[PDB]
Design a binder for these strands. Structure first.
Ligand SMILES: [K+]
Lengths: 111, 208, 177, 130, 205
RNA sequence: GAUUGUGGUAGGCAGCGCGCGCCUCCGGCGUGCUUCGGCAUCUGCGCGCUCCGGACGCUGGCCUGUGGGCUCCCCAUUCGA
């Protein structure tokens, strides 16, 4: 009915990069604050604890016949009460990723 | 030879019985009485003399460090309770991501042996890591499926062309699996369809 | 069941001496968030009203008092004296609650709200369970109705929990009484 | 106006907290903010009105009745069946059932819905062309 | 306010009967999080305190001007949409690139201009007057204040909104007729599919 | 769920199983003290096991490549200044 052209199966949820763990006057970019769509309480975060995440972005040059790049991470612990999480990546996320979407996968699975 | 454990474990590393009851059960009193009120002394096992290793061809200028002994030995990988023979699994990664497959058994290495069946969804006999799998509540009878001869060595590389023997074995295995699947209505379509997340579908709320 | 304020009966006396082999034993009914603070206030009152200090005094007993029937509503009267910005005054108040602990918590909250009197500036002189016919305040007497009937004028709209909270809604809330 | 009132015998739904989804009976009123509620499977205790949603059901009881009397009144009024049969009460049950569906059940429901949608679309097209 | 967390191309908000400050805070957070927001019917925004207090506040704002060069600011916009835009800017670090980008993701309109007149419009419960303001307390419409302080497009907006509402009423009547036809079709098709209705029954509301 | 493996000549320390007795083997059979449940009272040797004197194991990708690394250079962004 739609006639769309794209990924046929989605096995991940989206996450918005809010920023870094920080105080009013200090910033710690080693930790990233991520909001996962559909997660509204720290109790709900328990399911995603330890789940792998990928930050996919585009580069000007081609690497292995592709402009796509990926920085992997995972969910570490809940942040606050509203479902935000603290996440760690192999390298600190660039500040320009603020407001961009990361993919939160369903693995490693516990079910 | 005792055919049953003398001291069952209440928890890991703690026995149900104390030292006095263990003394009574083990029969140390009987051994002492038979031997004449004294325990029998057993000579220490004689060590094997080291083999006459030939002299080395080279002598290193530095004394290489020998690592300290590690007393920890790995245990077999655990299988989740939600995964039992005949359980339907959802693959979350790889070229078969989203496919629904039937679980057959766990191999020695800890990986899971699964089948599509191949005809239904194109998934052959394959090994899938437990960490990249979701165990659902759908179970299909697999009593008539014989996979005894298949083990971790069946998938070992010999290092392009699939031998016909593997195809025949997969067909033989899948015949009974499909026969069992046909019993449950709509199970064929369920196994032939992939799992996907639609709008407002929350993984942490789905029961699977 | 957790109460912020607990009722204790504290019993104490002055240390026995040669002159007084069996000194008078004093008891008080006090309100405090803990038994330690109840004992502290007991010694404060004993020092201020009987000349018996904690240093030269003896602690005998302390027991919590629980409402006999926390399943039923009662009318509670509280006689208290408080300190304002310009002096001290006496005050009698009435409350309705299942337990006297809840009534005392209400009393503290209301004193704070209406007179800006902090907790440490309030002394409770007397407490009692008042029958319906003997209540003096119109606020408590208005619910002494066999057929009490009113609509919920003010109801706040919220999801059962934050799990269902959403920033955007397709339609505005539909409210009626 | 004011189709619903808080009353002795009025049945209310707990709309917030750990007790969400439960039916209780208002057996007394403490003050403008909280009342005394009761039900067969709980201990009569106080609750703030902000956590109660009044229903259209009411039972004939006196204030602070006995547990047996309250149960008898609820059974005579058939509170459970009336609430369950009503659309408002059925809504919570349907939400719970939807939450409880499993993957295979969800797939079967999807198949049924697709078939019904196709048949309904054909029927509607025929009606329009008529 | 952590943020909505939704993934959408854009969100259209009907600002009617929304408290100005709370809606502004929620939308500022949404814009900072990377959302694109279109606000319509800004003239229907509600301000607590009443018309008199808000008018005096706006006159106090109008007093502020660079003494030696009034053209250097502050700029006193009169239209409701610009008032909402400035209020939002007040809650955003607009002097940084991040704040400027967040501001650039926001559109504000008076009334409902096209194509947003045929796009679903949502509301913000946390800023709704019905939930935030007790009945009887003083409030004023943003459009009324703007007209009092020098906005001269209120009547045109009213006329255009009346025309749009008439067209929307006609469309709604057509949709209701279509819905009745669809219910008739469903009734006709009921007898065709038994088992499917049986599986669907325990889920229907 | 998260961070982490510092050391590199030790089978130590602590606890416990199997054989040195038998029977009908989810257990039972001997001497003492018991609160009648039980008890470090008899508790020795040989071979083994463990939450036991600081991480080990398996698999995969890649190796002249649009690969990997970078403390170098020019920039952009968040925080600081
Ligand atoms: K670890």
């Amino acid at each position: 009915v739609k006639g769309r052209q794209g990924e046929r199966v989605r096995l991940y949820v989206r996450g918005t990069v809010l920023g870094y763990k920080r105080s009013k006057s200090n910033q710690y970019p080693s930790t990233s604050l991520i909001q996962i769509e559909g997660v509204n309480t720290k109790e709900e975060v328990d399911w995603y604890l330890g789940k792998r995440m990928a930050y996919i972005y585009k580069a000007k040059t081609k690497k292995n016949n592709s402009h796509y790049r990926c920085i992997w991470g995972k969910v570490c612990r809940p942040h606050g009460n509203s479902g935000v999480v603290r996440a760690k990546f192999k390298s600190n996320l660039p500040p320009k990723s603020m407001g961009s979407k990361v993919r939160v996968f369903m693995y490693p699975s516990n079910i | 030879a005792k055919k049953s454990p003398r001291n069952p474990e209440l928890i890991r590393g703690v026995g149900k019985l104390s030292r006095s009851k263990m003394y009574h059960k083990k029969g140390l009193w009987a051994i002492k009485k038979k031997n004449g009120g004294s325990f029998p002394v057993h000579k220490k096992a004689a060590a094997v003399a080291p083999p006459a290793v030939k002299p080395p061809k080279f002598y290193p200028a530095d004394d290489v460090a020998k690592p300290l002994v590690n007393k920890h030995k790995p245990k077999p990988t655990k299988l989740r309770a939600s995964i039992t023979p005949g359980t339907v699994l959802i693959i979350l990664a790889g070229r078969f991501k989203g496919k629904r497959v039937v679980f057959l058994k766990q191999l020695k290495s800890g990986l899971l042996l699964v089948s599509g069946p191949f005809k239904l969804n194109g998934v052959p006999l394959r090994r899938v890591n437990q960490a990249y799998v979701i165990g659902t509540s759908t179970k299909v009878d697999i009593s008539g499926v014989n996979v005894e001869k298949i083990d971790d060595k069946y998938f070992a590389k010999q290092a392009n062309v699939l031998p016909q023997g593997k195809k025949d074995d997969q067909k033989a295995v899948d015949e009974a699996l499909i026969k069992a699947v046909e019993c449950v209505p709509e199970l064929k379509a369920y196994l032939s369809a992939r799992f996907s997340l639609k709008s407002c579908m929350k993984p942490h709320e789905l029961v699977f | 069941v957790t109460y912020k304020f607990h009722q204790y009966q504290v019993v104490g006396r002055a240390l026995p001496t040669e002159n007084d082999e069996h000194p008078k034993i004093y008891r008080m009914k006090l309100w405090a968030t803990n038994e330690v603070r109840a004992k502290s206030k007991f010694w404060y009152y004993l020092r201020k009203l009987k000349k018996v200090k904690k240093s030269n005094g003896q602690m005998l007993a302390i027991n919590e008092i629980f409402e006999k029937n926390p399943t039923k509503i009662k009318n509670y009267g509280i006689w208290l004296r408080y300190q304002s910005r310009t002096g001290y005054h006496n005050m009698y108040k009435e409350y309705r609650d299942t337990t006297l602990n809840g009534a005392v918590e209400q009393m503290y909250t209301e004193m704070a709200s209406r007179h800006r009197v902090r907790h440490h500036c309030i002394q409770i002189i007397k407490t009692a369970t008042i029958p319906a016919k003997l209540c003096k305040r119109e606020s408590t007497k208005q619910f002494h109705d066999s057929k009490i009937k009113f609509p919920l004028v003010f109801k706040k709209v919220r999801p059962p929990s934050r799990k269902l909270k959403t920033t955007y809604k397709a339609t505005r809330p539909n409210l009626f009484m | 106006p004011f189709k619903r009132f808080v009353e002795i015998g009025r049945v209310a739904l707990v709309n917030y907290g750990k007790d969400y989804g439960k039916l209780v009976v208002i057996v007394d009123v403490i003050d403008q903010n909280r009342a005394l509620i009761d039900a067969p499977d709980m201990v009569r205790s106080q609750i703030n009105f902000k956590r109660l949603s009044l229903t259209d059901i009411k039972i004939d009881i006196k204030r602070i009745p006995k547990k047996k009397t309250l149960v008898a009144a609820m059974e005579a009024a058939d509170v459970k069946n009336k609430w369950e049969s009503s659309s408002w009460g059925r809504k919570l049950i349907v939400q719970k059932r939807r939450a409880s569906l499993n993957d295979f059940d969800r797939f079967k429901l999807m198949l049924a819905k697709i078939k019904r949608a196709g048949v309904v679309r054909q029927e509607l097209a025929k009606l329009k062309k008529e | 306010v952590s943020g909505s967390g939704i993934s959408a191309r854009r969100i259209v908000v009907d600002a009617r009967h929304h408290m100005l400050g709370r809606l502004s805070s929620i939308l500022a957070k949404e814009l900072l999080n990377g959302q694109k927001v279109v606000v319509v019917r800004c003239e229907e925004i509600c301000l607590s305190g009443g018309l008199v207090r808000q008018k005096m506040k706006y006159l106090r704002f109008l007093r502020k001007r660079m003494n030696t060069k009034p053209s250097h600011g502050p700029i006193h916009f009169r239209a409701p949409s610009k008032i909402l835009w400035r209020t939002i800017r007040g809650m955003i670090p607009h002097k940084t690139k991040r704040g400027a980008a967040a501001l650039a993701r926001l559109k504000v309109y008076e009334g409902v201009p096209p194509p947003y007149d045929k796009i679903k419009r949502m509301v913000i419960p946390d800023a709704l007057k019905v939930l935030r303001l007790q009945a009887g307390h003083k409030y004023c419409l943003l459009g009324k204040l703007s007209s009092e302080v020098g906005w001269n497009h209120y009547d045109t907006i009213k006329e255009l909104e009346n025309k749009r509402k008439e067209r929307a009423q006609v469309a709604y009547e057509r949709r209701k007729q279509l819905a009745k036809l669809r219910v008739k079709a469903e009734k006709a098709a009921e007898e065709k599919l038994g088992p499917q209705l049986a599986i669907i029954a325990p889920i229907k509301y």
